[PDB]
Amino acid sequence: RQDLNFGQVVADVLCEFLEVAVHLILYVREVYGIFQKRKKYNVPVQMSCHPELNQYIQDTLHCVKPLLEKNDVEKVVVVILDKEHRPVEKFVFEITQPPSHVEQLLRAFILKISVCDAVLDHNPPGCTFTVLVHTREAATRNMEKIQVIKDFPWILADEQDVHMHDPRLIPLKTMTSDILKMQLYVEER
Amino acid sequence: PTVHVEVHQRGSSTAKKEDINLSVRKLLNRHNIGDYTWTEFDEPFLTRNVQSVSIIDDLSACTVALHIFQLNEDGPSSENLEEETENIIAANHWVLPAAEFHGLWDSLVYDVEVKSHLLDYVMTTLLFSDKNVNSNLITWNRVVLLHGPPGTGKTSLCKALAQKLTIRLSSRYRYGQLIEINSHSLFSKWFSESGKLVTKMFQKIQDLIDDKDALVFVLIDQVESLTAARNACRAGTEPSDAIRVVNAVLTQIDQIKRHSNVVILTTSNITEKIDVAFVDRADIKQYIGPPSAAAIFKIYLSCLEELMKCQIIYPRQQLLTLRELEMIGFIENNVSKLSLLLNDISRKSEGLSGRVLRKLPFLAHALYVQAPTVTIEGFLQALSLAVDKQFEERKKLA
Amino acid sequence: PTVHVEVHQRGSSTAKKEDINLSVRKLLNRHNIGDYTWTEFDEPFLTRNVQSVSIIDDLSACTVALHIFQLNEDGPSSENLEEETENIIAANHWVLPAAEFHGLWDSLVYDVEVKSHLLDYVMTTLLFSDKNVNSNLITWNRVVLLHGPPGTGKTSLCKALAQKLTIRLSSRYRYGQLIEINSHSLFSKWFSESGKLVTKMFQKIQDLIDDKDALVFVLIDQVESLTAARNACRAGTEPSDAIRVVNAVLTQIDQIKRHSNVVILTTSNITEKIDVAFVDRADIKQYIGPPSAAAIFKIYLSCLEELMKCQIIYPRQQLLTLRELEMIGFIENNVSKLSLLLNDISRKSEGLSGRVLRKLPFLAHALYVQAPTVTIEGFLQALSLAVDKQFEERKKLA
Amino acid sequence: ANHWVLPAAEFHGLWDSLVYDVEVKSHLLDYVMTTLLFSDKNVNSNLITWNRVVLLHGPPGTGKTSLCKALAQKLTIRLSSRYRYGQLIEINSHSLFSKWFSESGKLVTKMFQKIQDLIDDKDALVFVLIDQVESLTAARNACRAGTEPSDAIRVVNAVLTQIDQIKRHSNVVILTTSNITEKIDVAFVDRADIKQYIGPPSAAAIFKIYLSCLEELMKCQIIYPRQQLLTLRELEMIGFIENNVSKLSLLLNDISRKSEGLSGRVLRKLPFLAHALYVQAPTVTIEGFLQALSLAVDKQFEERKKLA
């Protein structure tokens, strides 16, 4: 009789699910028109045609994907924001993590963020995103775990890209799961 | 011929240490006094200070420094280990001498002198540590392993000792400790976290160890849970994780080989499953078996004295000890009948462990003749029957 | 007829290397003459700089080579082969040998000149690398593998090899190194990260190796916890990265062969579980067992000498080694009966792991002496009792 | 993945040095010749079966990777009429597993866009050396009771189908090493047709290995007395009769017989080993060197018998 160990994917897939998510949201949040409608994860995902931006995401997320794997991350926030780097659309992926159901309910996620353009009011185009990595340690403790990437550097919690406000949450999702408490919600301003 | 004395000083009393040292010198050297204990009477102020004075094995020309102590009345202190959501106590933590372990070291009776060897081991450890003998030329890893048939006083000697030493080594080491390890918290379902936190637990023990006055006593009960033999089979049975923990304990049992304020008391009763690289690191490897006739008689003496003190027994009568019994010549007299008959009960009940030997009065008064106060003239017989029952209770179990 | 002589010079002094070289040179020119060492020097400057001089094996001054070394006193500098996200120790990177490794070679005593075998093996490695021998027509990967019962010195031999090789190659290489890789801190709970960590670890090793003069001995003490049986650990599935780390390890070791200054010392208590692709990739699959009667005699000689030094035993005596005992004729003329009794103990102490063999004087003293100071024959008979009791403990544990 | 443009300075001494007596090397040669000739001949696979896959297997450390590399060299130089050059690709299975699919899929897709760019010009002859194939079936055996299969099994299967995607053209060869002789759960066991077994070299190969080793030891005067040794053709025409000129050959032949089945890589390390332990000298004479090599082969046998 064979008792046996396990092989978790727990903390990493999230951000790369965010990858799909962000590749979707960068599309849906109307902050990408260089996006193209494609097919992935059995949904009408809208991705980017630029392999250059694909590698930009490789740097931004897929370099920190095992670095984001620390469980200290509270709010993986896609701040959808103007030139001032302050949110209008706080896609707060409040990752309340209790450590294929993940895509079983991110089916609803991707699908409804896709529908979010029927909920998201007309956000002005020409506004970018920042990936605010809310950890359990304030003011960007342990620069190494955030600047893991050699070619891709990181910065501390400088006063501009550290704060957010105007938290009107219409919880477009509350999709609790087994591994994840993906309390995603779109806090409008 | 040095003879030791322990003095229990209450938690209520507050008189400083040396004051009660000199007080007990006045006491003992006004009486000017194998093991005979006195209570805290015969003088007012010491009655307000001390509780009991006990001697351990005649003119007492050379005495010891009085071992004077307060029991701590706070039990375990659960200490989790995981960074987040431990929810499983990984290590209980007494600060000796605790309250519960009191009188434990004296109830246990071995008539083979396991206590003597297991005691002098630490004294010689100190002797070689203080005079600075080179590690390379003579060395030892500090591990004690105890094995035998189940229920013979193996976990009760790994804890009655971690108190007795702190009483003996009070002048040198000023507070003992005791860490009871919860083996089943160390393992983990996750891929490599099964040993990656055994190292964390031994790191915490080390962090406790650095204070060079502490006298840490790491205790591992039922070691086979922690060092199961490495060669089970090639299949998924005992996954790759159970090959790398048993050699993660072994790489920590020797990284705390250099300190001299550490002992590692460990118990197990099924030895043939302990890995062989652990069954050799051990420094004493002591075997304690079910008690013999004299130990049985002493156990029954203790039980009877406790009951007739607690009045679950009719007006009490005195009992004779093997020394006095041999001195009188086994003659049938006005008192010796009880001694001889209890001797037969002892001479009948060999082969049983300690647990049953201590249950037996309770069953013999719980099943057989029951009348809330029972005379010893009958109660001894009421025990004998119970003895036979156990043997019968074995045969029907085959 | 090359004869090596090495001098330990005290860390306080700072005299220039060649001046003290010529000074100890005319020291030998004063001596002009068996492995012998001195500490009772005469010349003042000689006393201020050097602590000891040692001759290592009737050859007066045929030819000598002189090595000078500076023992370090600071411990290993730990390192975290991680991005500081998770705090886990990775390798205890040493430096040119610390004072903890001093005397280690002298302590270890082996039956038939295996020590010299590894010595001239590494010497031959550098010698062949010197003649620019073509790599493809004849080649060799450096891996050494020591295996056998527990306690035979195999995790005490790699460090001593690091020591004496860094001492001997001092004329050719200024400093050595040592990297005791921690096997359990390489895997991860997430899958596919063990492969990412192993390549970073060995890439760090390559960085440390890049200085073509800097000598590096990687030490993998528990390879059987790092190289799981590749086919056996696939039946009864482990996670993906169980036989996905063995392949990467093998690839990096096969890669490391093209660097001039590398040795890879590995040890294993269990051979039936290591691998089939590894247990044949090692050059010297050297087998070390329990020491024989002569090695045991030398062990006990070292132990008794040390106890005479630290005054655990009061009267200093003289014990004739075996090669003197040959010439004396083994007569009973009251000069060498003590060494004869020690030889009898060496005879009856066959098969012990050789770690118990250093332990045994301490155990004997503790259990059967119960005194703080003794003569020699008492300690010998106590050691006899101790070896007998070790046999009894082995018997009763089955 | 690794990459080799053409047999380089590291790619002559192998095939000039790898020595098997069953002449399996010529067998691999003409097998691949038949494969390529049938392929350009447009024979149909249904009636007569032919695939561009060759599998090599046997005990570990017997030449399989070196044999694959040297075979690639030999075939790309021999085929001096169709392909001007070749390309050798060593695809390591380790570096393909990201955290989850949506990264590993793009990674393998990029790798095989590079592969398609390479093969787009059919001027050359391209190889792939899937080093170990059992590292793709172990990850597939864990559908339950292991890691998240969506990130392990799916990726390896998406590589296994891309293998059949690449194999479809007319100038590709597939080379693999397995090291198990019963079967493989991947579709490279039953569907493979060139499944050659490699074992330890036979008694006639130990002589040719040892003579090359001794010659290399001669090249830089490690052995001082430069005495002349004779190829096995000489010992067979002479009649195996002792004399004053062909005795070293005799002793070395007895050695070769004694060293039958150790390994390929080991019978190449034995002179160094013998010199390291049993010679203890900076320069050696061949007469005692052969006795030392005798002691070394005895030692290697004793060790392989000593590991229980």
Ligand SMILES: Nc1ncnc2c1ncn2[C@@H]1O[C@H](COP(=O)(O)OP(=O)(O)OP(O)(O)=S)[C@@H](O)[C@H]1O
């Ligand atoms: N020699 C003894 N004499 C009297 N009682 C004993 C003796 N040895 C053990 N006991 C009883 O053992 C009771 C405690 O049982 P435990 O000692 O827990 O058994 P164990 O001996 O711990 O064996 P394990 O491993 O835990 S099976 C003690 O309270 C003693 O009464």
Ligand SMILES: Nc1ncnc2c1ncn2[C@@H]1O[C@H](COP(=O)(O)OP(=O)(O)OP(O)(O)=S)[C@@H](O)[C@H]1O
């Ligand atoms: N020839 C010898 N004579 C006396 N003592 C020796 C000898 N060789 C080794 N030792 C002792 O053995 C100790 C080192 O043991 P190791 O060889 O490190 O044990 P180990 O092989 O790592 O144990 P494992 O991991 O369970 S196989 C040293 O402290 C030495 O005192």
Ligand SMILES: Nc1ncnc2c1ncn2[C@@H]1O[C@H](COP(=O)(O)OP(=O)(O)OP(O)(O)=S)[C@@H](O)[C@H]1O
């Ligand atoms: N029969 C042989 N004849 C000549 N040279 C050999 C022979 N066997 C090995 N060699 C050389 O010795 C080394 C052995 O390593 P490899 O050829 O890579 O073995 P392998 O094919 O990888 O076996 P595994 O199953 O992967 S351990 C190589 O440098 C070979 O070139």
